[PDB]
């Protein structure tokens, strides 16, 4: 059963049990859903509606332009080198480009700014729960992530349109995320996101007004492997356009990333590096195995 | 943390148990090991090496340079992670040989390759029997699983990794695990390059004169229920030196049924049961992506 | 000005003028277009439509698989030994293989059979006009071409898909045709076929519901050089997929080919041979000079 | 310091810094000189000699004729509506008139033809360097310039003879060039060409065996203002006849010119139009401000 965490149970004497659920999702799933997370359901509903309307208005034509430009009109053999995906990226931190994206509406930009700020505070709240579960001092992960200019925080807004031949192409090929903590607002009707657990692909179930959390490669390093970043993918379907609004809380470019000493006894197998060196490498090898990227930092 | 070198002549004597134990440790903890004092005549190895290197210089080097310019890798500017800096051709031995159909090979190279391949096929089957004994399986178990209808698949990849002006930019061969059963490598004894991933570090598979490098593929990880894992490996380039590689792949037949051996399965396995050719059709397209999704895809 | 022959003008006031124009194209161009040729325009439209749809369904992915098979994905330097071409061949005579091309529909097969029979009749009508212009007896060329089983007649169905760098590769390299008379139904929008005349490449202009005629090597022999087989090529372009349905009316395999004695005063420089010996040679040297093939038949 | 670019440094490890100099000149100067290009110094020396000898034999007459019919022999006060200039034009593409200029010698025409071909290839190589610096796809600008008949390429051969009172008249009044890329072989002793930069007229220094490059109005549109076409003029002097051999690589007449979409964020201030409409208008208003010509294309 996929972990669903009720964050409102942290405000009372059920808080220890909630923390234990968070910790075991972090150790064994790499993913969990959160409900009662404090984000207004009214804000999620308009983010959802304006994301979908901005797709028809602005992204659908770019998407078909892409399928023509790569011959994906007609899928007669398996395509393992492209994602059946429509995306644009919004940067929040350290410097916002929200007011420079030309094709987004005023009210969409205002909703995205509010949504991004609330998710940034929720990311930092979640990192503190991780710290507590890890036996780290409060604020430890936030301070590691800061670097010189503060954390990097952006939002990937994706749609995975219907695919006539889902067997032939993935919406997004299997990978682990490079960063710190990932907070996903996904479609509540159209499924597609899957994680790999114990040798099976497991669906990340659509759930109304929920946020999906998962941990990236940097948290595997800092926890000395105690919390691993898990492989995940998006599969297409013939009917349905799955919406994806995923926010990435990453260390600053010059943050020093290393295994926390209190989590290391035997010499660590994980490297110590500067985050931007990891991200330069990751961009070119995102869909290749994760383990060579750690070795490359030594 | 020393790379395992196994003396196969010590299986013939009082030290056979200690030698078997060493083999089993390499299979569990390295996925690779070198063997010495195997049956292969050192003069046949010297001939194979000599004729491979001369066939590169004579027939492949001009094609390799032409491939460079056709792809614009003659001048390297930024990292290339979708191309291998590699010159290769393939020789199929089983189930059906294509040796007499490679046009650009000499009669003496073709005859030596046929002889070399036959000896390596017999050595592959002897090594599979050592694994069976170490795993507690009946003798011939892995050979029988691999047979399918037409027998095992056996072929040889003959590769050269020529000097690369900028090695930090392109791999000789990107990191992957091998799809098949057991892989037997005769590699350059001077020029290094092959590396395996162990405990979060890339480790050189050291060139060693008249040795054979053994490693296990994805099919043995399934059959042993994860006890022997298929290990990630790559070939790095260098500015000088052309590393030769003659690698033989002993794989199950196309219609072989692959599954975890029942005596190694005390609770539900995380590994699938499938037909080998379905794994291979999938593997061809995703060879340089993670291994674990390929097992999940067989369920 | 590229010769366009109006076959309705044989009926016949300008019939001398039309015949003189046919003769002038045969001597000096080796190519000419015909209009009002009797082929139903609706049959041409069906052939064109089903040819273009059959490419998309059956050849376009085969074509992209061939490109990556041969490395023409990257055209960083000149390719002089490959044609940027998708083709299949249909034999009508003496023995049809129309029923063995498996990925074609019964409607396409029935239309090609009707089209091929009408083009075979037009080929023989055209050969009789050449006979008259040359002063040969009616039916002379048809009788020479017959051999024992009748003429050889087949259709090459080609498409020349768009090429990102057309200056690196030809759709089809310069050559002369080996056979008798060639009747080409080409794309009426996308140009590409060129002939060599007076040291210049001249486009063979797309013209709706027209047939392009050219003379092959066998007619150069029979006419003792009075009508020469002209070099031609197909150039690629970056946008546009030029279709080509080209039918070859050739002598039978065991036909005896020699210069017609009434066209020879001074001893001929052209050989006398059996057609299949010419064709067995031509296959290996099609894109090398034409003149050594005549010498090789002595 | 006026930018001088060594093109031979593109073949090696200094190529990035060379590209950076090119991009800097394109953004901030609109002009740059190139050395070590492909043109043989003996071809430049012969072009220069035969241009100067062609002035004395053929153009000096037409020039004094011009001064007659305009009353410019004596300059009592400023002349702001005529250029103190002797010119004839050579067209290369899409069609050459080189063999139709009556008063040009055989060897001048052969040199002029070889010179023009090398400058046409150098124009296209330079346009690809701009593409790379702009982040556009390789060949982007050449493809935009093509239209139906290919680029327009011609050569303006000018002399600016000595002027008794240079204060009264310009050799060529201040203007921006209408076209794409301009490649100038100018006098290496007699100066005169100036550009306007940061509120100062700056001399374009004569330099042995160099080519002066500048960008026209069409590249400002395509780059959405990132590379502007800058005002330039030729001043006269009392002693010295400055030679000017200027080749203009322009889009084809029916080319569609618009800001490249990857260079546009907010709505562009530049129009989208067909090049020949710009040229019709430019011809009549060449020495008036540039900005109204862009406004006129909307
Ligand atoms: O696009 C991704 O990589 C993604 C999106 C949401 C959650 C995890 N990963
Ligand atoms: O080419 C390979 O994948 C290979 C070759 C030799 C040994 C292991 N792997
Ligand atoms: O494919 C050919 O060689 C051909 C096709 C049409 C017309 C002339 N020649
Ligand atoms: O005559 C011109 O307008 C010109 C000549 C050379 C360079 C720039 N402009
Ligand atoms: Zn992800
Ligand atoms: Zn391998
Ligand atoms: Zn032909
Ligand atoms: Zn100018």
UniProtKB/Swiss-Prot annotation, chain B:
GO biological process, one term: cellular response to nitric oxide
Catalytic reaction equation(s): 1-aminocyclopropane-1-carboxylate + L-ascorbate + O2 = ethene + L-dehydroascorbate + hydrogen cyanide + CO2 + 2 H2O
Co-factor binding comment: Binds 1 Fe(2+) ion per subunit. Can also bind Cu(2+) ions.
UniProt cofactor(s): Fe(2+); Cu(2+)
InterPro entries referenced in this protein's UniProt entry, alphabetically: DIOX_N, IPNS-like_FE2OG_OXY, IPNS-like_sf, Oxoglu/Fe-dep_dioxygenase_dom, Plant_2OG-oxidoreductases
Keyword Lyase: no
One GO cellular component, as annotated: plant-type cell wall
Protein name stated in the entry: 1-aminocyclopropane-1-carboxylate oxidase 2
Species for this entry: Arabidopsis thaliana (Mouse-ear cress)
